Design a protein around this ligand. Structure first.
Ligand SMILES: */C=C\C(=O)N1CC[C@H](n2nc(C#Cc3cc(OC)cc(OC)c3)c3c(N)ncnc32)C1
Length: 298
């Protein structure tokens, strides 16, 4: 039983579901048309995305979808956070309606803009995409730092920051998404003492892996990995290294090598994000400032 939230509730008869968008990165999401959901244009039918439960959904899936919806209300509005548009919570299946990002997730967006002959390169709609420039990659990074700076200031830890969980709109705006694992924290480290092990290992800070704690500085570690993904145009981190072996390698101080499309400056930013001591990593505020400088110079 979900209590009504009138300000977010959207009528079912004004929503028309369409093609599936994929199930691998954000659960079951479908393209849809929502009549009058944009109150600036109240007559118009807007293309939206709708998250819903699969027929094989578990109790945890249901609880996770509700919690995700509530987190989106909590965090509030920002240019680089995927926007909640409404929900159908009464008298039928739970639908959460979010803004449509026509260019997919960041990993697919970057891989589609790789040069031909490179692994994972493909032409969307059998038509070649425009190449990424250096400026575009820095801009991408800047936007995501801004989004995470906002998220952290709302006292939220994401815990699953990765290119697969970033959405890209028609106007190439980066939107942080997938709040399945996100939590509101206080001022002290998030600690459970009970380990569920649902965090993607290759993006996790050592203190998350080993000490079972999470802070904003843990998200900074992940942001470093995201940076590496961006500058490798959607590369898979720790190339050729099994997830299983990374526990040992992190204890021995292993770090990824510099991407070729990366400047020495930006690689040092990555490496700073991967300081073993969390308090020695930059804050999102510092990352934004540094990236602002780099961007306005390029
Ligand atoms: C692994 C690739 C994959 O499955 N997809 C890539 C692009 C497809 N896609 N997913 C979304 C979304 C979403 C969403 C829904 C939420 O409901 C509570 C919450 C979110 O984060 C807080 C994100 C998507 C959108 N929105 N537009 C276009 N394609 C989309 C799936």
């Amino acid at each position: 039983e979900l209590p009504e939230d009138p300000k977010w509730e959207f009528p079912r008869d004004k929503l028309t579901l369409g093609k599936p968008l994929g199930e691998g990165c954000f659960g079951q999401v479908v393209m849809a048309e929502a009549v009058g959901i944009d109150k600036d244009k109240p007559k118009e039918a807007v293309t939206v995305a709708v998250k819903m439960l699969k027929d094989d959904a578990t109790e945890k899936d249901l609880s996770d979808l509700v919690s995700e919806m509530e987190m989106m209300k909590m965090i509030g509005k920002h240019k680089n956070i995927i926007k909640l548009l409404g929900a159908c919570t009464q008298d039928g299946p739970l639908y959460v309606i979010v803004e449509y990002a026509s260019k997919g997730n960041l990993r697919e967006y970057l891989r589609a803009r790789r040069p031909p002959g490179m692994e994972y390169s493909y032409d969307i709609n059998r038509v070649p995409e425009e190449q990424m420039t250096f400026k575009d990659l820095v801009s991408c990074t800047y936007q995501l730092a801004r989004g995470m700076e906002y998220l952290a200031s709302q006292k939220c830890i994401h815990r699953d920051l990765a290119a697969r969980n970033v959405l890209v709109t028609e106007n190439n705006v980066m939107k942080i998404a997938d709040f399945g694992l996100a939590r509101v924290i206080n001022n002290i480290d998030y600690y459970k003492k009970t380990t569920n092990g649902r965090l993607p290992v290759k993006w996790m800070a050592p203190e998350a892996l080993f000490d079972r704690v999470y802070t904003h500085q843990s998200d900074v570690w992940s942001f470093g990995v995201l940076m590496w993904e961006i500058f490798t145009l959607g590369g898979s981190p720790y190339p050729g290294i099994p997830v299983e072996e990374l526990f040992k390698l992190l204890k021995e101080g292993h770090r990824m090598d510099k991407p070729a499309n990366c400047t020495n400056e930006l690689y040092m930013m990555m490496r700073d994000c991967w300081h073993a001591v969390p308090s020695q990593r930059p804050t999102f505020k510092q990352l934004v400032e540094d990236l602002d400088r780099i961007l306005t110079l390029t």
